[PDB]
Amino acid sequence: TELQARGLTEKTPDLSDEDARLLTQRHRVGKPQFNRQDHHKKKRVSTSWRKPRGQLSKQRRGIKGKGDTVEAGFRSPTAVRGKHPSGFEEVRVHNVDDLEGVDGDTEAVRIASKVGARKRERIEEEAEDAGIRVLNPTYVEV
Amino acid sequence: AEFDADVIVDARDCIMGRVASQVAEQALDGETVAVVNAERAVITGREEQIVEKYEKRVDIGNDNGYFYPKRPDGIFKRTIRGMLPHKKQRGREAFESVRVYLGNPYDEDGEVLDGTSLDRLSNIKFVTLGEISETLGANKTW
Amino acid sequence: GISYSVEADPDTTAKAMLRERQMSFKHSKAIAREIKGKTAGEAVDYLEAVIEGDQPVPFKQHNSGVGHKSKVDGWDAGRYPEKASKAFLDLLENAVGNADHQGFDGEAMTIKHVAAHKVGEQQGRKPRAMGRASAWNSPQVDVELILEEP
RNA sequence: CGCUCUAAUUGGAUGGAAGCAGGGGCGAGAGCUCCUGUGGACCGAUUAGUGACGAAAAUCCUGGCCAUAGUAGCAGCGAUA
RNA sequence: ACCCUCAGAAGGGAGGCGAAAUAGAGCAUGAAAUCAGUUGGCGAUCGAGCGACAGGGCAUACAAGGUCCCUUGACGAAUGACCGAGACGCGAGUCUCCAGUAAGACUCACGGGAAGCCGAUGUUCUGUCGUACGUUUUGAAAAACGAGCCAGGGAGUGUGUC
Ligand SMILES: [Cl-]
Ligand SMILES: [Cl-]
Ligand SMILES: [Cl-]
Ligand SMILES: [Cl-]
Ligand SMILES: [Cl-]
Ligand SMILES: [Cl-]
Ligand SMILES: [Cl-]
Ligand SMILES: [Mg+2]
Ligand SMILES: [Mg+2]
Ligand SMILES: [Mg+2]
Ligand SMILES: [Mg+2]
Ligand SMILES: [Mg+2]
Ligand SMILES: [Mg+2]
Ligand SMILES: [Mg+2]
Ligand SMILES: [Mg+2]
Ligand SMILES: [Mg+2]
Ligand SMILES: [Mg+2]
Ligand code: NA
Ligand code: NA
Ligand code: NA
Ligand code: NA
Ligand code: NA
Ligand code: NA
Ligand code: NA
Ligand code: NA
Ligand code: NA
Ligand SMILES: [Sr+2]
Ligand SMILES: [Sr+2]
Ligand SMILES: [Sr+2]
Ligand SMILES: [Sr+2]
Ligand SMILES: [Sr+2]
Ligand SMILES: [Sr+2]
Ligand SMILES: [Sr+2]
Ligand SMILES: [Sr+2]
Ligand SMILES: [Sr+2]
């Protein structure tokens, strides 16, 4: 009648008071777009970041309004860097044997796109039984 | 035509720029101001030099135009505009909610704002806006 | 060539197309724009009046240098593109024909969709002065038409 | 960080590979990854190598395309048809 | 194929084949520039490096993000009072006490609420800052040089010796 996701979709990880604080910080502070200078001015200039090299470049010179230059001071906290917005650390899975050694309390799973529907069915049931959430579940008709 | 003014100001024997500065501040604060008796409004100084400045503004112009009002109606309105950011959205709304008048079209007598009145018994070197307009060539209709 | 850019329910609709027509694309946009919404029969009477010179086609986008016409309402510049109108009459002859064969009242049907697409150019070359040659091309136009039951 | 091909180790794909379009997540970032659609047969990862390995520019090269514009020309000539 | 249309071996429509005709003839895929139609946002009183960062309007099928708002309460850095009491100053105003107190960013807990709702994306409005880029140059927005736009192509290589 309706569509429902396979697995433990609502599962949340158990993070320490510090890791939960830092995750909430990352989410609040955020970061600038960091797109290439004048990407919007020319279609041939892509959004991808390149260091402003021009001796007169307004962005290189740090002129306010011309965008933030990439620096190390923009890095996210070590304790939380790379975590999914849920708080989970991602583990890329290709087969059933890749689900072994995974802690479903702290790590969630993301099945590779290249993996077919047949192998996905076997991974998704063996993930639910092992207490691991799949970030990209199959939506079956129930 | 009817104009629902919150504040009705009496310009009679009052220093134009000082009234204008306050009428501007009020218009930006969302007040609907109406300046009354502007023919009788005052501007201090040597008449001969005051008239020169205003006569020059009338002589200034080209094909693009420099429309300068000769009537006291418009002179006071232009003085208020110079104290407002009339080109911006917020500033235009403020300006359009301010109207200057010849005489008093209302029943109510206007209020005299603080620091604006000039003691005629203490001053000899001043001019009335109507006197400026008569010299500029405007048709006396007050 | 093109394909129909809009969906059409076969039960309440009639389709028609023109392929690689050597006529002005700029004139075709103007005609399509003006006949849209009109009844198939209204469109035929309109285009015949254009060919005759009694009704101007409003040129809203491709109007540079075009003189104003009094009969144009809401706008100023217009012309009488007879070649492109004669081609649109063939499109409406085909559509109303396909419509009648299906059991509909062809003439009474509304023009739900009509759009022209520049499908290419038939290339030509014109010899200029100083031993040089420049392009002298002909536009190749496709136009789709979807007649709908009122 | 990314690209090519080699090798070892190890994976994915017609229960839908690469590519492309739109969209979600991560990384300060080079960039990584997922979802949907399209596509319809290939594609990775790690390690050690290989290099015809990264473009916004050079009056750069080739191709394609827009505005210019339904504009100029389709008159001028002692042969005005 | 057949049928209809047409001046018509054209083209079109209907139809047939095939997993697929958006595989139908320079016919795998089918990007950008760009064009037609159309959707969303803005729009005929208003100002121009086209944006970055903040914050509002309107817009949003699913999926791949799930947060967000308000009462109250806990914690509470730097900073930090009003009122009042007393005491000065020609005066604007100030000192002492109340008090490092109330307050104070973030974060959290209970209760209540939102699912176009939070993020995010499109567009537009407001604030702040802002005259491209690369090169030449002491000094470039430059009335110094280069490019119409897009795609693809386009520059430290080999041998020998040190
Ligand atoms: Cl680092
Ligand atoms: Cl003038
Ligand atoms: Cl202004
Ligand atoms: Cl005096
Ligand atoms: Cl054209
Ligand atoms: Cl915190
Ligand atoms: Cl080098
Ligand atoms: Mg771009
Ligand atoms: Mg003309
Ligand atoms: Mg020659
Ligand atoms: Mg290995
Ligand atoms: Mg390249
Ligand atoms: Mg360069
Ligand atoms: Mg012209
Ligand atoms: Mg003759
Ligand atoms: Mg093809
Ligand atoms: Mg010099
Ligand atoms: Na004065
Ligand atoms: Na003047
Ligand atoms: Na008209
Ligand atoms: Na008219
Ligand atoms: Na917005
Ligand atoms: Na140069
Ligand atoms: Na420059
Ligand atoms: Na200059
Ligand atoms: Na050109
Ligand atoms: Sr896939
Ligand atoms: Sr135009
Ligand atoms: Sr397309
Ligand atoms: Sr190269
Ligand atoms: Sr080629
Ligand atoms: Sr052209
Ligand atoms: Sr002739
Ligand atoms: Sr067919
Ligand atoms: Sr405290």
- Could you give all domains of chain C from N- to C-terminal order, each with its CATH number? 1-150 (3.90.470.10)
Cα of B26 from ligand 27 centre, angstroms: 64
- Distance, CA of A87 to chain centre: 10
All domains of chain B, ordered by start, with CATH? 1-142 (3.90.1180.10)
Specified resolution (Å): 2.8
Number of domains in chain A: 1
Alpha-carbon span B27 to B47, nearest angstrom: 30
The per-residue b/e assignment along B27-53, b for 16 or more CB within 10 angstroms, e otherwise, is bbeebbbbbbbbbbbbbeeeeeebeee
A 64-83 residues, CB < 7 A, strand D:
70-72, 74-76, 80-83
Q: Using alpha carbons, select from A31, A104, A102, A43 the residue that is nearest to residue A71.
A: A31
* Chain C adjacent subunits, 3+ CB pairs under 8 A: none
C 63-82 residues, CB < 7 A, strand E:
none
Q: Which residues make Cβ contacts (< 8 Å) with residue B98, sequence separation at least 6?
A: B23, B24, B27, B32, B33, B34, B35, B77, B80
Say if CB C32 and CB C61 are below 8 A apart: no
Alpha-carbon span C77 to C35, nearest angstrom: 17
Cα of C70 from ligand 21 centre, angstroms: 5
Is the CB atom of residue A111 positioned under 7 angstroms from any atom of strand D?
Answer: yes
* H helix or E strand, kind and range, residue C97: helix C82-101
Exp. method: X-ray
Span CA (A85) to C1' (E67), Å: 10
User: Token pair for residue C107?
Assistant: 């003439």
Instruction: Identify each DSSP E strand in chain A by its residue range.
Output: 3-5, 89-93, 107-111, 139-141
Alpha-carbon span B50 to B44, nearest angstrom: 9
CA distances from B113 to A135, B18, B27, B45 (A): 69, 9, 14, 21
Say if CB A85 and CB A104 are below 8 A apart: no
Closest protein CA to C1' of nucleotide E107, residue: A21
* H helix or E strand, kind and range, residue A13: none
Q: Which nucleotides of D are covered by protein (CB under 7 A)?
A: 11-18, 25-31, 33-35, 43-44, 56-57, 65-66, 68-72
Range(s) of the domain holding residue A26: 1-142
Q: Using alpha carbons, select from B21, B23, B18 the residue that is nearest to residue B8.
A: B23
Alpha-carbon span C35 to C88, nearest angstrom: 10
Kindly tell me the number of DSSP H helices and DSSP E strands found in chain C: 3, 7
